[PDB]
């Protein structure tokens, strides 16, 4: 059949964010488990803020009235993804909040870490999301809002990151973070260590968290 066309658009990082993402990657930290209660904690707030939009407009709900977050190992693939069915992010969004505009927290949070303050700290920085770099060598979010159409981003920094509208599974709406693991973190595929994490780290959290787990493949 003819060849297919996809349009792609490539954006540089924020300087102090594509900093950032240079020292997580770069240097050693203990604690990297902290990701998960991070990208857990970014869920909930999503699934927050279309919670109350509902409540004022019920619609919101059309694509969707359950809220809650599935975590998926894929020891085949070693990728942990985190499926959430919250706001989602509209390709505005997407582009701001995850790259090309600076973050109020990354210049007092990089002098914070080499000063040697825990990575456990990154989430009250605002910065979080990044921490999913402290395991993942190449992250996804696939993303889906009321408002636009379901787009896929995609870095394994460098100071760039795509966005391109996705070809893959559509979802009603929410976000789903794939993370490409690191070949020494695979720990965080083991169901055992996932559970361990989630009852440390995410007993917060307001909504209803699923492992599945895999039995064939």
């Given at each position: 059949q003819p060849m297919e066309e996809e349009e792609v658009e490539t954006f540089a990082f924020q300087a102090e964010i594509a900093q950032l993402m240079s020292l997580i990657i770069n240097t050693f930290y203990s604690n990297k488990e902290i990701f998960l209660r991070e990208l857990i904690s970014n869920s909930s707030d999503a699934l927050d803020k279309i919670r109350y939009e509902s409540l004022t407009?019920?619609?919101?709900?059309?694509?969707?009235?359950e809220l809650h977050i599935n975590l998926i190992p894929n020891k085949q693939d070693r990728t942990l993804t985190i499926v959430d069915t919250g706001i989602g992010m509209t390709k505005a969004d997407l582009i701001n909040n995850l790259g090309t505009i600076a973050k109020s927290g990354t210049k007092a949070f990089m002098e914070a870490l080499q000063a040697?303050?825990?990575?456990?700290?990154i989430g009250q920085f605002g910065?979080?999301?990044?921490?999913?770099y402290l395991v993942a060598e190449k992250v996804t979010v696939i993303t889906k809002h009321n408002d636009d159409e379901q787009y896929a981003w995609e870095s394994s920094a460098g100071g760039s990151f795509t966005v391109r509208t996705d070809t893959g599974e559509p979802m009603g709406r929410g976000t789903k973070v794939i993370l490409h693991l690191?070949?020494?973190?695979?720990?965080?595929?083991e169901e055992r260590r996932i559970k361990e994490i989630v009852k440390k780290h995410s007993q917060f959290i307001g909504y209803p968290i699923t492992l599945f787990v895999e039995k064939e493949r």
């Open positions: 407009d019920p619609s919101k709900l059309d694509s969707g009235k040697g303050a825990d990575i456990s700290m910065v979080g999301f990044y921490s999913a690191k070949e020494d973190q695979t720990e965080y595929l």
